[PDB]
């Protein structure tokens, strides 16, 4: 689950995918169990350092494998600005969604 590959889907054959296992990142190990055991993702931003100039775009989709537990559309994020961006034009953690 830690690899690069061209995708096998019908229209993904020319799409280069970068896959990473969350379990293998050893994030849990950063803090002791005394601080709580339930550790869950709030939001992921994407940075592609110095890739694009001021008027250039990147087309890329970030997605989660086990999409089944998510609300529709929460399984994927649109990367386009490339500079610590997110899946929405305006990020607001105080929103209702």
């Amino acid at each position: 689950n830690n690899n690069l590959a061209f995708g096998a889907g019908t229209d993904t054959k020319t799409s280069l995918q970068a896959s990473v296992s969350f379990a293998d990142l050893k994030i849990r190990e950063d803090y002791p169990a005394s601080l709580g055991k339930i550790r869950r993702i709030k939001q992921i931003s994407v940075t592609l350092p110095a890739l694009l100039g001021p008027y250039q775009d990147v087309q890329a989709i970030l997605s989660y494998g086990d999409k089944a537990g998510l609300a529709n559309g929460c399984e994927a994020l649109a990367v386009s600005h490339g500079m610590n961006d997110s899946g929405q034009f305006q990020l607001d953690f105080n929103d209702g969604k």
């Binding site: 350092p49 110095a50 890739l51 694009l52 500079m83």
Partner: protein, 84 residues
């Protein structure tokens, strides 16, 4: 001296003496010459792509880092700096 509004420079130094009859004796002059600055006729353009995405919209600076001398290109991003 060869004068100009920006600067004058010494061009010739000549040793001369005078005779009592109202005349002169000279030794050959020492000439000096300086580098000019005439972009009007000699400026030249060169395209470059070695600077990649460098601009002043995004987080880039032309800087004298780590040894300085000629400046390099500093790129800043969230949580990290990169440098050429």
């Amino acid at each position: 001296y060869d004068e100009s509004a920006i600067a004058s420079t010494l061009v010739f130094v000549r040793r001369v003496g005078h005779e009592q009859d109202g005349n002169v004796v000279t030794l050959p002059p020492l000439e000096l010459a300086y580098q000019d600055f005439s972009p009007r006729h000699h400026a030249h353009w060169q395209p470059m792509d070695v600077l990649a995405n460098f601009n002043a919209i995004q987080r880039w600076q032309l800087v004298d880092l780590k040894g300085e001398g000629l400046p390099g290109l500093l790129y800043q991003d969230k949580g990290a700096w990169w440098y050429r």
